[PDB]
């Protein structure tokens, strides 16, 4: 949200993280950062607060810093039960809110990296015979377990009538993720092609449909 | 030493839920608490705040005005009174402890409850063919749209083709009806002389459909 974290960290057993959370100056650079441990399908645990303060039963493993408006959380010789989404949060004095980061999911790597195969299908002609419209976007075999999706309208971005999955764990232990955009058919005829990008690890791969 | 939140559930759009969250603490009463709350897969988003005894109230611009927190300290119960619902509302919500030592950090989290904003009643999926496009290897598939409740099955063939298959796990759209894809890859060679057929079924619609996939 308002804290800017980098989506996926990832190491081997034994080796070492660093997790980023970058503000301004009305909340990370006037108040105290805390990091939270989310593991899967549980609630937030508090990690660190006043920047630095380990809580109750959390190894020196884990460490928290900050410095002007950015903070930092470390964790070393990594363990499979690290494995979770890590929040950093302060005060926003602007807006009077409590604020968080968008979240870091921390893999403990298994497997080599793998970047994901992506297949786009356009609307069916049935689909447009009833006056609708649905692009599929099928996104598999990737690891680590974390995608950003985005649709194009030729070069515009569109973020109306998008519904993406949560990644799924698949048989092999990679992960599979969809994305549906829905369009009305004439907007569907009227752009000369529609790309469904997805972003792994910091690369791009896009797919491009036309209705031509 | 904990915090339980109670309340959570189904509801209709436009419709009204009241949070309960228990606390075990003889400490509840002298310490600030929170409502955050996350949308499935998304980021963790506060909601409300609420001081010892009630004197200050905070509230994030997405829920003001719709939203009240009150506590009952006599009670040891923290509340969240949600008015006028959108499906945007749809999140697990969880209870916090809000304290203070050189700054601010919430030390004490309950379990989290459910709150679903959806009108979605029973409904059978449409089924489209996707066709394969015009390394040597084609993707086909079949679209399951706007279906509810789960599951529903696919198969390729009545079950002969296996290699090359993914059904994909299903979307939870923002109106609360699922959908889902099934992709098969084939040779590219193969398409002028195979037949593939998916076979869906939706039990709690009485939906099954054997959908013919063709190219162009
Ligand atoms: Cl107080
Ligand atoms: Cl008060
Ligand atoms: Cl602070």
């Known amino acids: 949200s308002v804290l800017t974290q980098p989506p996926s960290v990832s190491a081997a057993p034994g080796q070492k993280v660093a997790v980023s959370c970058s503000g301004s100056?009305?909340?990370?650079?006037?108040?105290?950062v805390s990091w939270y441990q989310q593991l899967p399908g549980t609630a937030p645990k508090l990690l660190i607060y006043?920047?630095?303060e380990r809580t109750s039963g959390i190894p020196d493993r884990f460490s928290g810093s900050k410095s002007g408006t950015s903070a930092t959380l470390g964790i070393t010789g990594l363990q499979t039960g690290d494995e979770a989404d890590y929040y950093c949060?302060?005060?926003?004095?602007?807006?009077?809110?409590?604020?968080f980061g968008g979240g870091t999911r921390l893999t403990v790597l298994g497997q080599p990296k793998a970047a994901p195969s992506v297949t786009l299908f356009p609307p069916s002609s049935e689909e447009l015979q009833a006056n609708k419209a649905t692009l599929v976007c099928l996104i598999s075999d990737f690891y680590p377990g974390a995608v950003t999706v985005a649709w194009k309208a030729d070069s515009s971005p569109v973020k109306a009538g998008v519904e993406t999955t949560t990644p799924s764990k698949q048989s092999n232990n990679k992960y599979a993720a969809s994305s549906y955009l829905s369009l009305t058919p004439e907007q569907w005829k009227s752009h000369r092609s529609y790309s469904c990008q997805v972003t792994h690890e910091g690369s791009t791969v896009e797919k491009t449909v036309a209705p031509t | 030493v904990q915090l339980l939140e109670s309340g959570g559930g189904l509801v209709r759009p436009g419709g009204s839920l009241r949070l309960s969250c228990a606390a075990s603490?003889?400490?509840?009463?002298?310490?600030?608490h929170v409502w955050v709350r996350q949308a499935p897969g998304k980021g963790l988003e506060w909601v409300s705040a609420?001081?010892?005894?009630?004197?200050?109230?905070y509230y994030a611009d997405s829920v003001k005005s719709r939203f009240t927190i009150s506590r009952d300290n006599s009670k040891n119960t923290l509340y969240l009174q949600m008015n006028s619902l959108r499906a945007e509302d749809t999140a697990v919500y969880y209870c916090?402890?809000?304290?203070?030592?050189?700054?601010?950090?919430?030390?004490?989290w309950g379990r989290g409850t459910l709150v679903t904003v959806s009108s979605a009643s029973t409904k059978g999926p449409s089924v489209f063919p996707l066709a394969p496009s015009s390394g040597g290897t084609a993707a086909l598939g079949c679209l399951v749209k706007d279906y509810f409740p789960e599951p529903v099955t696919v198969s390729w063939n009545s079950g002969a083709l296996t290699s090359g298959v993914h059904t994909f796990p299903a979307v939870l759209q923002s109106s609360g009806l699922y959908s889902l894809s099934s992709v098969v890859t084939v040779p590219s060679s193969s398409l002028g002389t195979q037949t593939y057929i998916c076979n869906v079924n939706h039990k709690p619609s009485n939906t099954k459909v054997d959908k013919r996939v063709e190219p162009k």
């Open positions: 916090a402890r809000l304290r203070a030592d050189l700054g601010l950090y919430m030390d004490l």
């Open positions: 603490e003889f400490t509840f009463r002298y310490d600030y």
């Open positions: 609420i001081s010892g005894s009630g004197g200050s109230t």
């Open positions: 100056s009305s909340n990370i650079g006037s108040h105290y």
């Open positions: 006043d920047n630095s």
């Open positions: 949060g302060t005060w926003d004095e602007l807006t009077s809110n409590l604020v």
